[PDB]
mmCIF file of C-alpha atoms and ligand atoms in Angstrom:
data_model
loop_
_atom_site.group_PDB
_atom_site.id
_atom_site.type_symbol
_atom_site.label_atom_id
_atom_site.label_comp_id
_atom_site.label_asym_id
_atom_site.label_seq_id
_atom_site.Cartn_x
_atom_site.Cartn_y
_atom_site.Cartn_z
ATOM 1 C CA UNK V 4 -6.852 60.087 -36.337
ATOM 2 C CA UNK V 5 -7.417 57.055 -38.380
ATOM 3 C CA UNK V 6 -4.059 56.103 -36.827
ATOM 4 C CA UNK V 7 -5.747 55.847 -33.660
ATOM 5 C CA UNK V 8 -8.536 53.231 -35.710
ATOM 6 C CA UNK V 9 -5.087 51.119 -36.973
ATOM 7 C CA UNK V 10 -3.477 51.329 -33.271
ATOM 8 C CA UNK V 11 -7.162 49.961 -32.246
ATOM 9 C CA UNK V 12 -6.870 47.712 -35.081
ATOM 10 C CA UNK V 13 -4.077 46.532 -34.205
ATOM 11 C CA UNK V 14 -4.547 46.026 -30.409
ATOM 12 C CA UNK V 15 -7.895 43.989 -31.072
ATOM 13 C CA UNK V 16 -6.204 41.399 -33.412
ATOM 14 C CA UNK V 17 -3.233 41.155 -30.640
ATOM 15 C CA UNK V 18 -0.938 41.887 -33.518
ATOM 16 C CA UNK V 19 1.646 42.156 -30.331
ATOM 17 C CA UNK V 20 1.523 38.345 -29.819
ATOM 18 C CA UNK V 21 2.686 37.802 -34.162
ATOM 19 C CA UNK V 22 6.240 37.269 -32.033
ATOM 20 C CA UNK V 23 5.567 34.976 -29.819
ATOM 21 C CA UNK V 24 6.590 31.949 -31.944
ATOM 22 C CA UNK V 25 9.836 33.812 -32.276
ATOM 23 C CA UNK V 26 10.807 34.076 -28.479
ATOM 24 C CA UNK V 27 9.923 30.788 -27.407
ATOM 25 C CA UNK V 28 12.137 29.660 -30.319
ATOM 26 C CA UNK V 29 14.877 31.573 -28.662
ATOM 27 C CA UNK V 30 14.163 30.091 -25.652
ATOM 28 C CA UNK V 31 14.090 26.821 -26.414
ATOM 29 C CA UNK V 32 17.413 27.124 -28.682
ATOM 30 C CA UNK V 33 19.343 27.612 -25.281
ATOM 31 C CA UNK V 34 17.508 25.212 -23.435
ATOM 32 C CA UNK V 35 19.036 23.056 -26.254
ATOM 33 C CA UNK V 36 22.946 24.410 -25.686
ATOM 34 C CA UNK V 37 22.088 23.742 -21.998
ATOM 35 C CA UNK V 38 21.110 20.138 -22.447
ATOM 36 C CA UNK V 39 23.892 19.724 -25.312
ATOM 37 C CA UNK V 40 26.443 20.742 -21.954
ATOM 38 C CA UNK V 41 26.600 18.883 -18.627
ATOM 39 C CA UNK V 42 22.657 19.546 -17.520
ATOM 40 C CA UNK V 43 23.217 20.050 -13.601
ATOM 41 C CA UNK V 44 19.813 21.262 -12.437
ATOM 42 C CA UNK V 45 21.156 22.605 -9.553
ATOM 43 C CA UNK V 46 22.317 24.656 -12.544
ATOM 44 C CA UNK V 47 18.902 25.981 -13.963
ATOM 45 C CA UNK V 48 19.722 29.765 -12.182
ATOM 46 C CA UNK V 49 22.018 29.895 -15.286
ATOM 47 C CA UNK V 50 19.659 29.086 -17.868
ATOM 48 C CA UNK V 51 17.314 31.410 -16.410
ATOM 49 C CA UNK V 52 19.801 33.592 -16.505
ATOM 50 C CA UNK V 53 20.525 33.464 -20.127
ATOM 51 C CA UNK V 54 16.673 33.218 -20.919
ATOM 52 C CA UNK V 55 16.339 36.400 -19.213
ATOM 53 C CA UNK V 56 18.754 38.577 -21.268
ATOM 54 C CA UNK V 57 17.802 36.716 -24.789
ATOM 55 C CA UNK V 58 14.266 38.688 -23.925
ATOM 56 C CA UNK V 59 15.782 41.968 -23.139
ATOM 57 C CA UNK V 60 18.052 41.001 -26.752
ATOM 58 C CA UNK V 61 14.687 40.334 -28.491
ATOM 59 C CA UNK V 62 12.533 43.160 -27.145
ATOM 60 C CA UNK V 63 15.407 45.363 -28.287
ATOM 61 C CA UNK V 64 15.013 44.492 -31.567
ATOM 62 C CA UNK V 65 11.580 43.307 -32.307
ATOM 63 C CA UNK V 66 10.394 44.803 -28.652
ATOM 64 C CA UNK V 67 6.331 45.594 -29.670
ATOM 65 C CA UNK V 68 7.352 48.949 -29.108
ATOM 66 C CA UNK V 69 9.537 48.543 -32.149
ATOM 67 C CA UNK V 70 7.803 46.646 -34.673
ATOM 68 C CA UNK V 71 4.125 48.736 -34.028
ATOM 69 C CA UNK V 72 4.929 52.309 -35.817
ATOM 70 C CA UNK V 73 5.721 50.445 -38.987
ATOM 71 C CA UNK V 74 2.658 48.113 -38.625
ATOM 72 C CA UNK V 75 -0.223 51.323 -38.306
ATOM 73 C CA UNK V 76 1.458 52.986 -41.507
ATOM 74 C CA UNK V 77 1.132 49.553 -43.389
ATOM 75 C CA UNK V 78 -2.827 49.940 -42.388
ATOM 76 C CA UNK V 79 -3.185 53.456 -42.761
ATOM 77 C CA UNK V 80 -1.833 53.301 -46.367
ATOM 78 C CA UNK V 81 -3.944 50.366 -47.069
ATOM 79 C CA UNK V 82 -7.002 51.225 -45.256
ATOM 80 C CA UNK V 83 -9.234 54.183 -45.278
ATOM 81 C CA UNK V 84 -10.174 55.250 -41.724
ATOM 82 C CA UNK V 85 -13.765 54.746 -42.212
ATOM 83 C CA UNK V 86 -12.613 51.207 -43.892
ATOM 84 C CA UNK V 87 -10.403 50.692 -40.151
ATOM 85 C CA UNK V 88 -13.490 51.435 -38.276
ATOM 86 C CA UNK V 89 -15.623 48.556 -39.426
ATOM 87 C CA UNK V 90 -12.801 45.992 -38.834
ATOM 88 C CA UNK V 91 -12.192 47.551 -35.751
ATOM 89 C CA UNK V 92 -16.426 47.554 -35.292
ATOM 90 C CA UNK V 93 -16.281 43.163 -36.648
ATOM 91 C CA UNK V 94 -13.530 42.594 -34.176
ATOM 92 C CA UNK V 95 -14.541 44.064 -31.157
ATOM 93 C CA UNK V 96 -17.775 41.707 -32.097
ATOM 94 C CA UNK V 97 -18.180 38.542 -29.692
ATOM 95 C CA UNK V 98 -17.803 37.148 -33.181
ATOM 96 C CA UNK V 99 -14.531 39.004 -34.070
ATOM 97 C CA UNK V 100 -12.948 37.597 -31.217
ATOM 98 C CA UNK V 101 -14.402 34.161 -31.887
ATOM 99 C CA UNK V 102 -12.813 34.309 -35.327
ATOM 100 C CA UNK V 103 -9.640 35.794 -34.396
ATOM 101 C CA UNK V 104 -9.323 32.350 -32.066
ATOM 102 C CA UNK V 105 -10.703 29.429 -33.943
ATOM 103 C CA UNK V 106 -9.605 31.064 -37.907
ATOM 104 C CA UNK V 107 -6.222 28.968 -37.081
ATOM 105 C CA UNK V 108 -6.843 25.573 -35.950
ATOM 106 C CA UNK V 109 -9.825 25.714 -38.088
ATOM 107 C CA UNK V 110 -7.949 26.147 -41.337
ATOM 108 C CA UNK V 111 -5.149 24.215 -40.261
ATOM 109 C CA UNK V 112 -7.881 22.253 -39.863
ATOM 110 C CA UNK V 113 -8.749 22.195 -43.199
ATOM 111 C CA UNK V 114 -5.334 22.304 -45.026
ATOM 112 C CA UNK V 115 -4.490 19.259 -42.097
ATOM 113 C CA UNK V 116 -7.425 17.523 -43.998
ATOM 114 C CA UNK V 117 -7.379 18.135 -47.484
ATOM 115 C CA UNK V 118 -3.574 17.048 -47.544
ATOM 116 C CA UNK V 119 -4.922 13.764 -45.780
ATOM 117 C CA UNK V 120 -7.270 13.221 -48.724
ATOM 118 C CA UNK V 121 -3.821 14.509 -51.459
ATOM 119 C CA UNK V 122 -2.617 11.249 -49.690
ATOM 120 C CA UNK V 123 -5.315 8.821 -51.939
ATOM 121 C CA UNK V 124 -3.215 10.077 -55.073
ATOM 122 C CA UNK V 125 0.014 10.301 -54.689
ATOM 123 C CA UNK V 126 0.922 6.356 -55.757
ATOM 124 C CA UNK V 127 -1.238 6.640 -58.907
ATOM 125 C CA UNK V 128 0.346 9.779 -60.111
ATOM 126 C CA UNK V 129 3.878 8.362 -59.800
ATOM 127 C CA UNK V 130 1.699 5.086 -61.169
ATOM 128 C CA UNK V 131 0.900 7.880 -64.617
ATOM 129 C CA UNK V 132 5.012 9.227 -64.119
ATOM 130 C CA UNK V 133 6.055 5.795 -64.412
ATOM 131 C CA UNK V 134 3.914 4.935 -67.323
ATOM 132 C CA UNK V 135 4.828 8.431 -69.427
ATOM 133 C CA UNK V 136 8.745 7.255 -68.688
ATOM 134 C CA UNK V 137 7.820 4.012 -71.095
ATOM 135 C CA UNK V 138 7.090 5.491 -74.272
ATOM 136 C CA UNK Y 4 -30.276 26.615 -44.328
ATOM 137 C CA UNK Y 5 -27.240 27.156 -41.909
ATOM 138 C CA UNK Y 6 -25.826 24.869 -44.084
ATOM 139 C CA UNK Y 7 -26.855 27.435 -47.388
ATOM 140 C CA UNK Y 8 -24.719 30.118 -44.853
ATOM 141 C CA UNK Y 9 -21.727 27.690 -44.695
ATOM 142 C CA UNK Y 10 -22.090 27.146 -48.147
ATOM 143 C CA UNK Y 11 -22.301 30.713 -49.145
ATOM 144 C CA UNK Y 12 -19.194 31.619 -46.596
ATOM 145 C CA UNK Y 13 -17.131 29.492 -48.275
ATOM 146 C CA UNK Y 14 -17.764 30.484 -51.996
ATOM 147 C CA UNK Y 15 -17.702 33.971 -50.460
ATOM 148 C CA UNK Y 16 -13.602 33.200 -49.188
ATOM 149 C CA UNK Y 17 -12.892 31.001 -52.377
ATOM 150 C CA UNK Y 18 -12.039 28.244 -50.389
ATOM 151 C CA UNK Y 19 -12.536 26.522 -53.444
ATOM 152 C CA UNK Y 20 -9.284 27.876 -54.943
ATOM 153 C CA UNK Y 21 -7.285 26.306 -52.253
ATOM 154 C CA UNK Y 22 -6.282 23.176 -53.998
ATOM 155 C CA UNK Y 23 -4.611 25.593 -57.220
ATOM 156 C CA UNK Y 24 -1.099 25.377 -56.021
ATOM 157 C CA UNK Y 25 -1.793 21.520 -55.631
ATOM 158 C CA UNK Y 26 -3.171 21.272 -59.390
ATOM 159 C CA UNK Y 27 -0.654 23.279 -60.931
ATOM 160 C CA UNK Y 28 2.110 21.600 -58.835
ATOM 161 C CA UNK Y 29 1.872 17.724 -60.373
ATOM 162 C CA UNK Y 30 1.190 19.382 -63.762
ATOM 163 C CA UNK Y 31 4.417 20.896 -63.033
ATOM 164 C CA UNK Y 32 6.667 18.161 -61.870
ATOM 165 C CA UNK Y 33 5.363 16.308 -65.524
ATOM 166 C CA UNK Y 34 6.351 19.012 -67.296
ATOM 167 C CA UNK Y 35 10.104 18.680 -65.553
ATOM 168 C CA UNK Y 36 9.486 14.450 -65.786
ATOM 169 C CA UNK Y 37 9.064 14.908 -69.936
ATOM 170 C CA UNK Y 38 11.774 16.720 -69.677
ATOM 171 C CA UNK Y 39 14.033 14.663 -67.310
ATOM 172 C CA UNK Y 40 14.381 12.936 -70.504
ATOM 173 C CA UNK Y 41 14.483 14.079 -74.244
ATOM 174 C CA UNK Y 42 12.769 16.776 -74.997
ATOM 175 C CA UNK Y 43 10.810 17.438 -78.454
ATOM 176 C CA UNK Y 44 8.259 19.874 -79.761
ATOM 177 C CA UNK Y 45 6.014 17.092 -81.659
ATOM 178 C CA UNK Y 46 5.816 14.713 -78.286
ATOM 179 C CA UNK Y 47 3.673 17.847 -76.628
ATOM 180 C CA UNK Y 48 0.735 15.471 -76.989
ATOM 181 C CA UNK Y 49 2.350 12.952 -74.685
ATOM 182 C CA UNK Y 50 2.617 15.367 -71.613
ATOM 183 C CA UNK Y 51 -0.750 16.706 -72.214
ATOM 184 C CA UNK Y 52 -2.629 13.511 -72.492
ATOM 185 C CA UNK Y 53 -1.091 11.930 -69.845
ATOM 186 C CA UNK Y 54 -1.564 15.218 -67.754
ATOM 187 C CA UNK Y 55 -5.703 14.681 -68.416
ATOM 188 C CA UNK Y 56 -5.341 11.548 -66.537
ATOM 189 C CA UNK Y 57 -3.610 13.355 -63.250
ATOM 190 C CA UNK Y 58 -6.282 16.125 -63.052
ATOM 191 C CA UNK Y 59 -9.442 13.468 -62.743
ATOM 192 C CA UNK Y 60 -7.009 11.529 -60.584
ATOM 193 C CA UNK Y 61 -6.925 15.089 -58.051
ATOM 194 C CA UNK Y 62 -10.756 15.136 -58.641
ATOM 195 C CA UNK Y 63 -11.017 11.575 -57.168
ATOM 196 C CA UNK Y 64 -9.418 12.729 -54.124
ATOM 197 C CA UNK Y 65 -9.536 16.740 -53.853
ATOM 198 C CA UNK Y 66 -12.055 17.539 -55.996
ATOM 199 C CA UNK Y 67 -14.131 20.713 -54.225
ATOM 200 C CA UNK Y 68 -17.225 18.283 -54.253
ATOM 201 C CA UNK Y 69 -15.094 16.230 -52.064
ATOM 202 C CA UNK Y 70 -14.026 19.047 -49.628
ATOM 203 C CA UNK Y 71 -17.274 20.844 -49.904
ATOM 204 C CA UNK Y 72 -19.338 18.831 -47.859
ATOM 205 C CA UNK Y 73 -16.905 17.548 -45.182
ATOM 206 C CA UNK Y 74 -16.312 21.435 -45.125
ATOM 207 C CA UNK Y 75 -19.462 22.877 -44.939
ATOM 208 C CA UNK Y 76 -19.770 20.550 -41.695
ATOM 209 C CA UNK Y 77 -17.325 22.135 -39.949
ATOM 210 C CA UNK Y 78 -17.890 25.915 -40.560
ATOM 211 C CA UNK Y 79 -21.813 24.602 -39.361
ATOM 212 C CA UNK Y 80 -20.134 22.433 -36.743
ATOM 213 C CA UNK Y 81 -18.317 25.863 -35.620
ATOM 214 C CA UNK Y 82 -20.624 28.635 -35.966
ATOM 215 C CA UNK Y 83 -24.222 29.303 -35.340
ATOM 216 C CA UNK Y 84 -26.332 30.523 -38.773
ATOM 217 C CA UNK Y 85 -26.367 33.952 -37.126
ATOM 218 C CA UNK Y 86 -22.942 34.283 -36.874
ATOM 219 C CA UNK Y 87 -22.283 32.821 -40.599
ATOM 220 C CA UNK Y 88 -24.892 35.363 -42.032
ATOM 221 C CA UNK Y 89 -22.516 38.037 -40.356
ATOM 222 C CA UNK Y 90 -19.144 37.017 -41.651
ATOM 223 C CA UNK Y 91 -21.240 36.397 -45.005
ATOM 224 C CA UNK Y 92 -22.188 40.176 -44.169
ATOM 225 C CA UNK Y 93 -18.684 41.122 -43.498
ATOM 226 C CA UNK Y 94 -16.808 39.446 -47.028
ATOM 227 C CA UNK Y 95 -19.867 40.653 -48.942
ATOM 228 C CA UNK Y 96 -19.634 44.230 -48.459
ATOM 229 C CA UNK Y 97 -16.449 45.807 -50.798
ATOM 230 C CA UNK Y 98 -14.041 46.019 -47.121
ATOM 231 C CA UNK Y 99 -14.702 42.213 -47.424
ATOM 232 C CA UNK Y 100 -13.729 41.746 -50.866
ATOM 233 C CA UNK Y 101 -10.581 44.048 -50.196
ATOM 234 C CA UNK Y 102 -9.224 42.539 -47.273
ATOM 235 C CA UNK Y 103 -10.076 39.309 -48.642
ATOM 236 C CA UNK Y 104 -7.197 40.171 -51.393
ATOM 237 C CA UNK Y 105 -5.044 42.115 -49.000
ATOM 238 C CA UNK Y 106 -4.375 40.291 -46.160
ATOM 239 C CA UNK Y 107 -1.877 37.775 -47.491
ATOM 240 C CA UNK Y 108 0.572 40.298 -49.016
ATOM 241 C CA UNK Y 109 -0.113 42.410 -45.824
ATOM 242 C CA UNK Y 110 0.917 39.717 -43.344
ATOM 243 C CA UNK Y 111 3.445 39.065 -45.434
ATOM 244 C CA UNK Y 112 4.767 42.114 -45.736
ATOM 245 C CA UNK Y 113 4.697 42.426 -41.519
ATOM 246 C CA UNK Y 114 6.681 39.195 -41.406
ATOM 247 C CA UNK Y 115 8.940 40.761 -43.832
ATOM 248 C CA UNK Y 116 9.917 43.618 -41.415
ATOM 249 C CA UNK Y 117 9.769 41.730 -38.267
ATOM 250 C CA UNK Y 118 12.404 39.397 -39.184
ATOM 251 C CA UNK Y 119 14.110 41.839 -41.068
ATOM 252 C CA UNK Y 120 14.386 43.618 -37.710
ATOM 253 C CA UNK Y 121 15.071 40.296 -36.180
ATOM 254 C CA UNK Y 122 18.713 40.166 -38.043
ATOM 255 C CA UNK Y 123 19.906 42.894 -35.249
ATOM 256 C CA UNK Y 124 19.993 40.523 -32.693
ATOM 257 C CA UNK Y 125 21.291 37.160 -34.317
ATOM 258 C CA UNK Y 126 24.760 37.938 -32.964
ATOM 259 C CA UNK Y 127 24.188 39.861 -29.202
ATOM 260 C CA UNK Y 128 22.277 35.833 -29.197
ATOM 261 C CA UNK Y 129 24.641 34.349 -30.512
ATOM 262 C CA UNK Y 130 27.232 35.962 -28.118
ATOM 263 C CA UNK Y 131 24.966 35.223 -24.939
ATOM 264 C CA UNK Y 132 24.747 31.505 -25.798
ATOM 265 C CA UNK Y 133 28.679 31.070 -26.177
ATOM 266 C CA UNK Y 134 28.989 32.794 -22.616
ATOM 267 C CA UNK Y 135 26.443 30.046 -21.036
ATOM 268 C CA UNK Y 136 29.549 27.571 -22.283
ATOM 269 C CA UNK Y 137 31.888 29.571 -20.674
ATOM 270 C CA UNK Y 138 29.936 27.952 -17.797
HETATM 271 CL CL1 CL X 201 -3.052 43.695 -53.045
#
C-alpha cells in the first residue's frame, strides 16, 4: 500500500542504476586480464564472452530484482506512506528530476571547489606544525 | 532576491557544516603532532594556542563567508528563483528536515547490503576470469 509509494519511490530516483558503478568495474577488471594476456583483437569474441557471463554472475547476486525487496522495507520503516507520497509527488516534479541529475556534479562541484580553496592552507599549517615541534 | 532563495537553500541544507570534518581534522593531527613527542598535562596550553592560529588560518581559506558567495552563484547559476523557493518549500516542511537527517545513514545502509550481497559473486568472478587465461 505504502509499499507501492516506496516501489514508486524507488523507481523515480532510478535506485536500479545505484549498481552501475559496480558492473562497469567488473567489466573493465577483465578488460584489464585481457590486455595483461596476448591482446589479439581478432580475439575480442572472448572478452565478450567473459563480459557476458560476469553480468549474468552480477545480476545473480545484486540482479535489481535482488537488491529491491530489501530497499522498499528500508523506506517503509523509515517513511510514513503519506511522508512517501510527497517525495514521490517532489520527484515526479520537472524539478525532482532536475535535482535527481545535477545534485551530483553540482556538489561534487562544490566539495571539487572547496578542497581547491583547503589547498591555500595546507603549507602554513605544516608552517604552525613545524613551529609547535620547536618549543 | 533569487539570490535571498540561494541563500536561504543553503542555510536550509547546512551547507555551512560541510567544512566540520575539515576543522576537526587539523585540530586532530596537532593533537597526535604534541603527542608525536612528549606528552605532559601542564604543556595543554601549547596545543591549544597554537591550535587558535590553524582555525583563522581555515577561515582565510574555507571560511563559509568564503564559500558562501562563490556558492550562492552557482545554486542561482543552476536554478531559477521559482524552483529554489520550491526546494526551500520542500527542506522547510518537517519531511524536509527528516530526510535531510536520514538520507546519509539510509544510503549508507543500501550500500551496506548491496555489497554485502556483492560478496556472493567474488569467486564465480574470480573463476570466470582464470578460465579467459585458460585461453
Ligand atoms: Cl537517523
Amino acid at each position: 500500500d505504502s509499499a507501492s509509494q516506496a516501489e514508486q519511490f524507488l523507481k523515480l530516483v532510478h535506485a536500479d542504476k545505484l549498481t552501475v558503478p559496480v558492473y562497469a568495474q567488473v567489466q573493465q577488471m577483465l578488460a584489464q586480464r585481457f590486455a595483461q594476456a596476448k591482446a589479439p583483437e581478432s580475439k575480442k569474441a572472448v572478452l565478450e564472452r567473459y563480459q557476458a557471463k560476469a553480468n549474468a554472475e552480477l545480476d545473480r547476486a545484486i540482479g535489481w530484482d535482488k537488491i529491491k525487496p530489501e530497499l522498499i522495507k528500508l523506506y517503509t520503516t523509515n517513511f510514513t506512506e503519506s511522508e512517501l507520497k510527497d517525495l514521490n509527488a517532489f520527484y515526479q516534479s520537472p524539478l525532482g528530476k532536475k535535482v535527481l541529475e545535477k545534485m551530483p556534479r553540482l556538489t561534487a562541484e562544490s566539495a571539487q571547489l572547496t578542497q581547491a580553496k583547503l589547498q591555500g592552507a595546507v603549507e602554513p599549517v605544516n608552517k604552525l606544525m613545524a613551529d609547535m615541534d620547536k618549543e
